[PDB]
Amino acid sequence: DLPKMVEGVFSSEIDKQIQATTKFRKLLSKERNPPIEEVIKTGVVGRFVEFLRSPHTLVQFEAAWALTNIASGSATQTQVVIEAGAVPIFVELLGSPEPDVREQAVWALGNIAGDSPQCRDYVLSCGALRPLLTLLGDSRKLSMLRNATWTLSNFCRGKTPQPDWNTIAPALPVLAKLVYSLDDEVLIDACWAISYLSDGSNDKIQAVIEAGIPRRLVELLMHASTSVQTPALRSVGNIVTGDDVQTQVIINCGALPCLLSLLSSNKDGIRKEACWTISNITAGNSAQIQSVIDANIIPPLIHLLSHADLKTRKEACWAISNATSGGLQKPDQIRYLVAQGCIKPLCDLLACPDNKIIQVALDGLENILKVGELDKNAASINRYALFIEECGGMEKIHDCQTNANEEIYMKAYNIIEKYFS
C-alpha cells in the first residue's frame, strides 16, 4: 500500500528501505500504465538516488531499476530523475563490483540518454562513454553486451544536434568489434549506432573507414535478418556519400554484388535504400560507373524506374541519371544505358510531380542526346533524338517549358531548340 511504501523508503533501516523500494520497483515494472507519475508525486525519487550510494548492493540495484523505469516515461518524468542528480552517480556505478548494479546503470543511462539529443549530451558530459566502452570490451555476459550496445547506440543517436565528434569518436573501435558479435541483437544496435555516426561529413566517414568497419558491414548486407541488413545498408549508403576514394573502399569490399541482390529484397525500404546507395556510387568517377555496369546493376535499375512505389522510381532515376555523367570520357556507357532502354522510363518521369526529379530526368536526357549528336556528326541524324521523338518523349520535354522552376523550363527550351527545331 502506497503510503506505507513511502514510509519504508524514508525509514533509516536498510531492510525497510529495501522492502519498500522493491515494491516500488515492481510497481514501476507494470506492463500497462506504470504509475510513474504517482510514484514521482510521493517524493521518493530523491531517496532512490541516495540509495544509489548505499554499500548494500541490493538497494543500489532496486533503486537503479526503479529509476530506470521512471526514466522510461515522458521527457518531464525523465527530467525528474535528471534533476535529482542521478546521472553522475549512474556513471560511478558503471564501475560497481557487482555486475547487476553495473548493468542496471547501463540500462538507466540508455533511457536517459535516449530521451533527446540534449539529454544525450548531458549524459556524455558526465563522462559516461569511456566506462561504457570498457564494459563492452570486458563483459562476457550476453545481457550486458545487449544492454551496453543498445545504450551505446543511444549515445550515438540524434541530429538536433549530433554529438560532439571528438567526444563520441572513441566508440568506433568498439563498434568495429561488436559487428562481429554472434548475437543478432548486439549486431542490430551496433549497426544502427554505426549508421548514426557515419551520417556526416567526409572526415567522419574517414574515421569509420579507418576503424576497419566497411568490410564487415558489407558482409552484413547479406545477413539473414532484415533487422541487421537495414542498418548495415544505411551505413554503407552513408559511406558512399563520401569522396571517390572513400566510395572505392566500398566497391573494393565487394558491395556491388550485394547491392544487386538487395535490389530484390522483400522489404521496400531496403530496395529503395539499395537504389540510393547505388546512385551515390554512379555519382562518382568513370571507373565507378563502369563498376556498376560490370556488376549488371543497370537492368534491374531500369526495371525499377517503372515498377514499385514512387519513392523507388525516384531513387532509381537519380541512379541512372548519375550514370550518364561521362559522355565525354566514356560515351560507351551512355550507349549501354540507351541500349538497356533507359530513355522511355526517363521520359515518363518528366511528368513527375517532383521538380527535382524532372530536372534529374532532363539532365540525363540532355547527356543522352549529346552522345547521339556526337555519333551523328561522325556518320544522317541524332538517333537518340529520334527515339525520344517517336516514343513521345519530345512532347513531354515540350510540356516542361511550362514549369516555372527556372532550372527546368530553360533546360527544356534548349533541348527543343538544339535537337528538335
Binding site: 515494472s29 522510461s72 533511457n111 535516449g114
Partner: peptide, 7 residues
C-alpha cells in the same frame, strides 16, 4: 521510442 522499460 528509443527507451526500454525493464519488465
Amino acid at each position: 521510442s528509443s527507451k526500454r522499460q525493464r519488465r
